[PDB]
C-alpha cells in the first residue's frame with residue numbers, strides 16, 4: 001500500500017533540481033575546505049533500508065526488538081573508528097551515534113562540564129568553531145556560550161595561536177575544558193602544550209579535529225590522542241565519509257568517562273540513531289585505514305602547499321603566510337575587497353569557496369578574506385601542477401572583483417548587478433567548467 | 443583519486459550484514475509503533491550527492507557559494523510541509539533543518555524559554571517522550587530537565603490525560619511552555635483544553651505530533667494547528683519519511699517566533715544542514731498531501747481498531763481499553779510477565795515490538811507492558827482480516843512466555859535460556875516468516 005515508482009517518475013520536479021545540482025558539482029572547482037565527494041559505496045549505505053530501524057540505546061542494550069543485525073553494524077563502526085585513529089580499544093572508546101559535528105561537540109562538552117560549566121575556545125574570527133563557546137557583545141550566539149559559561153581566546157596578529165594568552169586565560173578563568181582544533185586554522189596544533197596548560201588548572205583537553213582528521217589518522221600531522229581527553233570529529237570533511245560525527249574518550253586518563261559521554265549522547269540529547277549514517281561511517285573508515293587513503297591525504301597537503309605557493313607567487317597574501325594542512329585563508333585587504341564580494345564572483349564562475357574572517361576583522365558581516373582548501377579537488381585527481389591553474393582563476397576572479405567594484409560601487413547589491421553577462425566572467429566560467437567537467441567524478 | 447567499486451565489492455563484510463538486515467525486515471511482523479518502511483524514492487534522495495554540500499544558514503543567506511540548487515530543494519521542502527499540514531504560508535512557518543525529533547524539540551524549547559526556562563511535559567511512564575522534560579529522583583535523564591526547569595504531569599489510573607492535574611500544575615508551577623502530543627499514548631488529545639490552560643498562565647502551547655502526524659495531516663484526528671504555538675514532528679514514523687524533523691511556528695499568534703526558532707536551529711545548535719534528508723523529506727511530503735496517502739493512513743487506524751478488538755476478544759488487557767490511533771499498549775499484568783520477556787519471545791519469532799510502561803509502574807526496569815502499532819504492517823498491505831492473525835501470534839507469544847517463565851524462572855538471563863530450539867517458537871517463527879516474507883516490501 002505504497003508507491004514504488006522510481007524518483008524520476010514519482011517526483012519529476014525534485015529529480016530535476018537533483019540532476020541540476022549533480023551537473024553543477026561536476027562542473028565546479030570546489031574549494032570549500034570542509035567539503036568532499038563521497039564514493040558510490042558511502043551513498044549506497046546512506047540510502048539503505050537500515051534507516052528503518054529504531055534502536056535507541058547501545059548494542060545488546062536496545063529498547064526495541066529485531067536489532068541483531070543493527071548491533072553488528074554499530075559494533076563494526078566503533079571497531080573501524082578506533083582502528084582508523086591507531087588507538088587501542090582498551091585505552092580509548094568511541095560513540096558513533098552523534099548526528100553531526102555540532103551535536104557531537106555539545107554532547108561531549110556537557111558530559112564533561114554540565115550546565116553552567118566553564119569552557120575555553122578559540123574565537124570564531126581567529127578560526128574557532130561556533131560550538132567552541134562563540135558569543136558576541138549582543139547575544140549568546142551558540143548554545144555553547146549559553147548552556148555553558150565560555151571565554152574565548154584570540155590568536156596573535158600574525159594569525160597563530162597565542163599559547164601565552166591561552167595560559168593567562170586558563171589561570172584566571174579556571175575552565176573545566178579547553179578546546180583546541182579548529183574550523184579555519186591553517187597551522188598544526190601544539191597539543192602537548194595544551195595538555196601542559198590543562199594539567200596546570202585541572203581542565204579536560206578537548207581536541208576537535210574535524211578539519212584535519214585524515215592527517216591525524218595517517219600520521220601526517222600532530223596526534224591529539226597522545227594528549228587529549230576528548231577527541232571529536234565529523235565524518236564528512238577531509239575524512240570523506242557521510243555527514244555524521246564521532247566522540248573519542250580516553251578511558252585510561254578518565255575512568256567512567258565512557259558512561260558520561262554515552263549517556264550525554266543518549267538519552268541526554270538524542271533519540272533513535274541514524275543507522276544508515278553509522279553504516280556509511282563504517283564503510284568509509286575501512287578506506288581510511290588503507291595505505292591508499294594515506295596517499296590521497298598526502299596529495300591533499302601537496303596540493304595545499306603548492307596552491308599556497310602559487311598564490312604567493314601572484315602577490316596574494318595568506319594568513320600565517322602559508323599552511324600546514326589542507327586549507328588556506330586569503331587576506332584580501334591589499335585589494336580593498338570583501339570575502340562576500342569574492343564569493344559571488346567565484347560562484348558566477350563555478351568556483352565554490354567561502355568568505356572568512358581574518359585576525360584584524362572586528363565585524364563578521366563585511367569580512368576581509370576567503371577560505372580555500374584542497375580535499376575535494378584532490379579527490380577529483382588534481383595534482384600540484386593543477387594548483388597554478390586554480391591560483392590563476394582565483395587571481396583573475398580577484399581582479400574582476402576589483403573592476404566590478406570600481407564600476408558599480410561598494411554595496412553588495414550594487415556589486416551583483418555587474419555579474420550577469422560579464423564577458424570575462426563568461427570566458428572564465430567556460431574555462432572553469434571545461435576543466436572541472438572532465439575530472440574523475442565519484 | 444577515489445575507489446568507485448560498488449559496496450558489495452568494496453566492503454563484502456558490511457554488505458553481508460545489510461543483506462542480512464534486509465532479509466530480517468522482509469520476514470518480520472513489525473509492530474514497532476514508531477517504525478515504517480520508506481519507498482525507493484525516499485531512499486534515492488538519502489543517497490544523493492546533495493549531501494556533499496555545506497549550506498549553513500537559510501536559502502539566499504548561505505555562508506558558502508554553490509548553493510543555488512540547494513536553496514530550491516530547501517524551499518520546495520518548506521512549501522510541501524506547510525501544504526501537507528494545511529496551513530497557509532502566511533500564518534505558519536517551518537524550519538526543515540532539524541536532524542531528528544529529539545534535536546527539534548530541544549531547539550524549539552530553547553527558542554521559547556531559554557536556559558533555566560520552565561516547561562511542562564507528560565511523564566515518560568504515562569506515555570510522554572524523553573524530550574518532554576524527563577527526569578528521575580536519581581538523575582536529570584534528559585537535557586530537557588537540566589538546561590530547562592521541568593515538571594511532569596501523570597495520566598490517571600485508567601491511562602488518560604488528567605486535564606485537571608495539568609491545570610493544578612500550571613497554576614502552581616507557572617511554566618513558559620506546556621508540551622502535549624506523546625510517544626506511547628493511545629488516545630487523541632484535547633488541544634483546545636490545553637490552549638485554555640496555556641492562556642491562563644500565558645504559556646506557549648507545544649504540540650509534538652511525531653507519532654500521529656499523518657492523522658493530523660489527513661484530518662482523521664484533532665488538528666493541533668488550530669490552537670498550538672509550536673508544532674514539532676519527526677518525518678520517519680507514521681509520516682513515512684526519512685529520519686528527520688520539522689518545527690512549525692505560528693507567526694500570527696507570535697510575531698518574531700520565526701527568527702527565534704530559526705536562530706535556535708542555526709546557529710544556536712546545528713551547523714551544516716543534511717541536504718539529503720531535506721530532499722527526502724520533500725519527496726515524502728508530496729505523497730503525504732495526495733488522497734492516496736489518506737487511504738493508507740485510514741487503513742492504519744482501521745487496522746489498529748481491529749487489532750485492539752481481536753486482542754480484547756482473546757482476553758488481553760489494553761491501556762485505556764482501546765485506541766484512537768495507530769498504537770496500542772498491552773497491559774501484561776494478568777499474565778505475571780514483563781514486557782522485556784515478551785520482547786525477547788517476539789524477537790525469537792520475528793515479531794518486532796518494544797517493552798513499554800503502564801500507569802501502575804514505578805520502575806522503568808521491569809515494565810508491565812508492550813507497545814504495538816500498525817503503520818509498518820499497514821504499509822506492507824495488511825488489512826483488518828490480517829489483524830486477527832497478528833493478535834493470534836501475540837497471544838501465542840504471551841502463552842509461550844508464561845510457560846518459559848514457569849520452567850526457567852523470573853530472571854531474564856534465565857528466561858532467555860529457554861528460547862533457542864524451542865519447538866513452538868520455531869513453529870511460530872516459521873508461521874511468521876511464511877506470511878511476512880510473502881507481503882509487498884518497498
Ligand SMILES: Cc1[nH]nc2c1[C@](c1cc(C#N)cc(-c3ccc(S(=O)(=O)N(C)C)s3)c1)(C(C)C)C(C#N)=C(N)O2
Pocket residue numbers: 123124125126127128129130136141183184339354355356357364365367498505709713
Ligand atoms: C558558518 C561558520 N560556522 N563555523 C564557522 C563559520 C565561519 C564563518 C565565517 C563568516 C564569515 N565571513 C561568518 C560566520 C558567522 C556565522 C554565524 C555568525 S552569527 O552567529 O550569526 N553572529 C555572530 C553574527 S557570524 C562564520 C566559516 C567557516 C563559514 C568561520 C569563519 N570565519 C568560522 N571560524 O567557523
Ligand SMILES: Cc1[nH]nc2c1[C@](c1cc(C#N)cc(-c3ccc(S(=O)(=O)N(C)C)s3)c1)(C(C)C)C(C#N)=C(N)O2
Pocket residue numbers: 056063267271566567568569570571572578583625626781796797798799806809
Ligand atoms: C526509549 C524511549 N524513548 N522515549 C520513550 C521511550 C519508551 C521507553 C520505554 C521503556 C520501557 N520499557 C523504557 C524507557 C527508558 C529509556 C531511558 C530510560 S533512562 O532515562 O535511561 N532511565 C530512566 C533508566 S527509561 C523508555 C519507549 C517508546 C521505548 C517510552 C515508554 N514507555 C516512552 N514513553 O518514550
Ligand SMILES: Cc1ncc(COP(=O)(O)O)c(CNCC(=O)O)c1O
Pocket residue numbers: 033034100101102103105129131181182183184208209210211234244496712713714715
Ligand atoms: C572544527 C569544526 N567542528 C565542528 C563543525 C560542525 O559540523 P556540522 O556542520 O556537521 O555540525 C565544523 C563545521 N564547520 C563549517 C566549515 O568548516 O565549513 C568545524 O569546522
Ligand SMILES: Cc1ncc(COP(=O)(O)O)c(CNCC(=O)O)c1O
Pocket residue numbers: 054270271272273475476542543544545547571573623624625626650651652653676
Ligand atoms: C513524540 C516523540 N517526539 C520525539 C521523538 C524523538 O525522535 P528521534 O528518535 O528521531 O530523536 C520520539 C521518538 N520516539 C521513540 C518511539 O516512539 O519509538 C517521539 O515518540
Ligand SMILES: [Cl-]
Pocket residue numbers: 046274276277488716718719
Ligand atoms: Cl542521513
